[PDB]
């Protein structure tokens, strides 16, 4: 069979992307969207939109049936599984395969095989990879190789990836091809990269990941078999459509690449997430009232949401990627530089404060044939100097004054002058440093501090608790923010339960 | 059970779903007698009541009451055409920055003919003028 | 004369109101009490005679400072009018109260989430908060003006008016 | 310092520019209750009014 119409169940910019790949293919494409993303870029730009349910992911993305349902519904004859969801669950990569319905990816097999740390780790015994000895790392980088295999076994290393820029092993930042690797390491990585592939079986797209070791030690980390959400930089280096490849691929069609393709040039990726750098990269839910994309020469934007658009607190903070490509490092440094100069995003906090730190720092800008980031220098070493977001509120005194803006042309340059609104260069008004938006208790009710889900319920009906014993946890943008008991007493009025959907306020339980 | 996006409504028993529904409402109060009834009123080049409204009122300024209100009336199969509003737009809003109490009617519905309710909201916007002053 | 004004504050473990003493009140009838359970100025918090209790006569001034901060000097004068027209257009946290009603409707929720939003500022001043606390009674500013809040309390009593949350709303 | 200032929000000038904008900007920046409308008001001998408008006029400073 071939595909002749795509179903995709993922949300935001891997959506858009996949959408916008079926119809360079031709092909019809099919969104499906949770309660909350009836707004989303991806429900308008699909050829046709279906309704799934429910306001958290694992109501409206997580369940099978919804998304075979909308499948069949539809007459979609393909599912592509995006990057979050059900990419690697193998169950339902199965049932898939049981709709008869193409399956844009890896065998169920090999997505349980290579899930399975130990079958993994023996898989790569097999394959002869470079295995750490013993060893743990201390100031690890983590490097990668996009892998391109059909079905008939052919494997291609489209490029590396450096991906060392990480907070909680998540990436913020990532380059490609891998800077500073001797070529006798280049050619480990990609050899390891397609015999780990061919002895676990693998075919469709897939990233093999590494550490690099500070004396170079390579040592196989993880295969990750999903189009990773990095895949754009080695796009824009190699110059391939990874995202057609995996369509060719599921076509059942050998490669068309017969070898590597030589890089051109280098690539950087930032990740725009909806996260306050200037707080411990708290994700925070909110409006984003203006989104201005980076522009022109060497910079890609795909990006999940547009001005207007509001992010609730029940999906991945995820924003956009910034893609920026330049014939040399030095020259897409400076090419990042100006894009993350022209980014703006209004209404909530991101981590773009950082991204233009970090594209500014020496240990990231490296001596010219080393650096110093490691998986851990986010945390450890980079001198957090952003401040917390604030927005428009008013915190001081003079901020509540009324500020007309004008431009002002003087000797022919153009200023941009703020006037307060009664500046002496309101008949009884009293300017005074207002309060917080903030509860500034002895009260009984444990409340939910944020908007959430309730994924665990520590307490029981009757129970016993101290100050500070867990009571529940809420998944807020997939983080856990485990609420706790404020003050000693019996636990006399539960309304919470697992899975439920929790408003900000919400009494959680009564401690008396 | 999934549906398409052109049939698909938010549950009702949800706070998200009850606001859809306020919006789904409220749109349907800008045409409580169809889109043709107002074509075929800019087709004679009027304007319609909240049209008028938005015009001499400072932009913004409206704040529209009773956008709801449906007549009562049972009399000569009337219960079976209820159209939102009937027929009279009332609120308050600025001109030039002062404040100042209005109410428009509207021609499209009943032939702008005074009921009940539509008398209601009128005597409603006059007792706020009042004791505002 | 102290129940005729219009506030009364109070110090813990400081400040009592009884009519009768505890040995008066022994030697009569031989009901026995302590100060704290008849006089105390949070058992008279509750029963609603007393409208604060604080920890300190510099607390207590500062909370008369603030609860003069709303009024004008007399019924003819005019209250001040403090940081007027801040926040002119739709914020984030007039956006976050769209999703701040729990779907269930059994489910409890603490008022405060909505007044810190809807008025100018988080100096929603409240009055008589242990006085029937299933209603809450405040002062806040809107466009820098005073105005008198009465809310119900969902977090309390499910936001029952009782007795107290009565008489507490009526005389404010 | 919580006044309020002027802020130039983009370019710099020189300080003779700075001169010119700040003197240009510079350069273009009791009671008597007699027969007060209140009083010419009629009012009913019972009018509510009498409190809430004429006295709240001829006391309130
Ligand atoms: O929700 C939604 C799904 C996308 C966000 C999570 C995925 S997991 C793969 C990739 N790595 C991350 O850190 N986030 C995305």
């Not at chain 1, 295995?131 to 690890?140: E, I, S, T």
């Not at chain 1, 369509?247 to 069609?253: D, L, Q, T």
């Amino acid at each position: 069979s071939k595909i002749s119409k795509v179903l995709v169940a993922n949300r935001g910019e891997i959506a858009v992307r996949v959408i916008r790949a079926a119809k360079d293919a031709g092909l019809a494409s099919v969104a499906v969207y949770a309660e909350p993303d009836a707004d989303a870029p991806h429900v308008r730009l699909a050829d046709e939109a279906f309704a799934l349910g429910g306001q958290t992911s694992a109501e409206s993305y997580l369940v099978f049936e919804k998304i075979l349902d909308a499948a069949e519904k539809s007459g979609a004859n393909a599912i592509h599984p995006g990057y979050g969801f059900l990419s690697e669950n193998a169950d339902f990569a199965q049932a898939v395969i049981d709709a008869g319905l193409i399956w844009i990816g890896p065998s169920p097999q090999s997505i349980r095989d290579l899930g399975d740390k130990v079958t993994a780790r023996h898989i790569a015994a097999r394959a002869k990879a470079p295995l750490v000895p013993g060893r743990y790392l201390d100031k690890p980088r983590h490097v990668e190789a996009q892998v391109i295999a059909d079905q008939h076994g052919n494997v291609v290393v489209a490029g590396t990836r450096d991906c060392s820029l990480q907070r909680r092993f998540q990436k913020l930042v990532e380059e490609a091809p891998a800077p500073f690797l001797t070529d006798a390491q280049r050619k480990e990585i990609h050899e390891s990269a397609k015999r780990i592939c061919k002895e676990a079986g693998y075919y469709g797209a897939g990233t093999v990941e590494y550490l690099v070791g500070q004396d170079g030690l390579i040592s196989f980390l993880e295969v990750n078999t999903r189009l990773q959400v990095e895949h754009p930089v080695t796009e824009e280096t190699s110059g391939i459509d990874l995202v057609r490849q995996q369509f060719k691929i599921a076509n059942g069609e050998p490669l068309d690449i017969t070898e590597d393709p030589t890089p051109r040039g280098h690539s950087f990726e930032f990740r725009i997430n909806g996260e306050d750098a200037g707080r411990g990269f708290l994700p925070a839910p909110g409006p984003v009232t203006k989104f201005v994309a980076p522009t022109g020469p060497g910079v890609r934007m795909d990006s999940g949401v547009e001005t207007g658009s509001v992010i609730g607190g029940q999906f991945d903070s995820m924003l956009a990627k910034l893609i920026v490509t330049g014939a040399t490092r030095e020259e897409a440094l400076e090419r990042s530089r100006r894009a993350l100069a022209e980014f703006t995003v209004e209404g909530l906090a991101t981590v773009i404060p950082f991204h233009r730190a970090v594209v500014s720092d020496p240990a990231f800008i490296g001596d010219g044939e080393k650096f110093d980031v490691h998986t851990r220098w986010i945390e450890t070493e980079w001198n957090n100097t952003v401040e917390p977001f604030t927005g428009g509120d008013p915190i001081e005194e003079e901020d509540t004054v009324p500020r007309q803006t004008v431009v002002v042309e003087v000797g022919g340059r153009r200023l941009e002058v703020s006037l307060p609104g009664d500046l002496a260069i309101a008949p009884g008004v009293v300017r005074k440093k207002p309060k917080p938006r903030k509860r500034g208790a002895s009260g009984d009710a444990v409340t939910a501090p944020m908007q959430g889900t309730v994924v665990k319920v520590a307490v029981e009906e009757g129970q016993e608790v101290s100050a500070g014993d867990l009571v529940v946890v809420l998944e807020a943008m997939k983080m856990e923010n485990p609420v706790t008991a404020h003050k000693d007493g019996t636990i006399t009025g539960l309304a919470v339960e697992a899975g439920a959907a929790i408003t900000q306020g919400t009494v959680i339980a009564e401690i008396k | 059970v999934t549906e398409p996006s052109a049939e698909h409504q938010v549950d009702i028993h949800t706070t998200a779903g009850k606001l859809a529904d306020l919006k789904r409402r409220t749109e349907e109060t800008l045409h409580p007698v169809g889109e043709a009834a107002v074509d075929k009123v800019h087709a004679k080049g009027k304007l319609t009541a909240r049209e008028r409204i938005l015009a001499l009122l400072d932009e913004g300024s409206f704040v529209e009451l009773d956008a709801l209100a449906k007549h009562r009336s049972t009399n000569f199969g009337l219960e079976k055409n209820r159209p939102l509003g009937d027929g009279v737009i009332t609120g308050y809003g600025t001109i030039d920055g002062r404040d100042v109490c209005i109410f428009s009617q509207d021609a499209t519905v009943f032939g702008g003919s005074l009921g009940e309710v539509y008398g209601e909201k009128i005597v409603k916007v006059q007792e706020l003028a009042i004791k505002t002053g | 004369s102290p129940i005729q004004t219009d506030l009364l504050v109070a110090v813990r473990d400081q400040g009592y109101m009884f009519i009768t003493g505890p040995d008066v009140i022994k030697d009569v009838t031989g009901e026995d009490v302590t100060f704290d359970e008849l006089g105390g100025a949070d058992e008279q918090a509750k029963r609603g005679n007393i409208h604060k209790v604080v920890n300190s006569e510099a607390e207590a001034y500062q909370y008369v400072r603030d609860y003069l901060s709303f009024l004008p000097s007399n019924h003819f004068d005019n209250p001040p009018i403090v940081n007027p027209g801040m926040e002119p257009e739709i914020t984030p946290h007039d956006l976050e109260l769209d999703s701040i009603v729990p779907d269930a409707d059994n489910m409890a929720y603490d008022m405060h989430e909505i007044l810190l939003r809807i008025f100018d500022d988080g100096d929603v001043f409240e009055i008589a908060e242990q006085r029937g606390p299933a209603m809450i009674t405040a002062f806040a500013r809107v466009d820098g003006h005073p105005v008198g809040v009465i809310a119900n309390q969902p977090m309390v009593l499910s936001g029952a008016i009782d007795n107290e949350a009565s008489d507490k709303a009526a005389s404010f | 310092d919580h006044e309020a200032h002027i802020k130039v929000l983009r370019g710099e000038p020189t300080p003779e520019e700075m001169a010119a904008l700040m003197a240009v900007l510079a350069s273009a920046g009791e009671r008597n209750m007699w027969g007060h409308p209140v009083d010419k008001l009629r009012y009913s001998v019972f009018s509510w009014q009498r409190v809430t408008l004429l006295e709240r006029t001829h006391m309130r400073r």
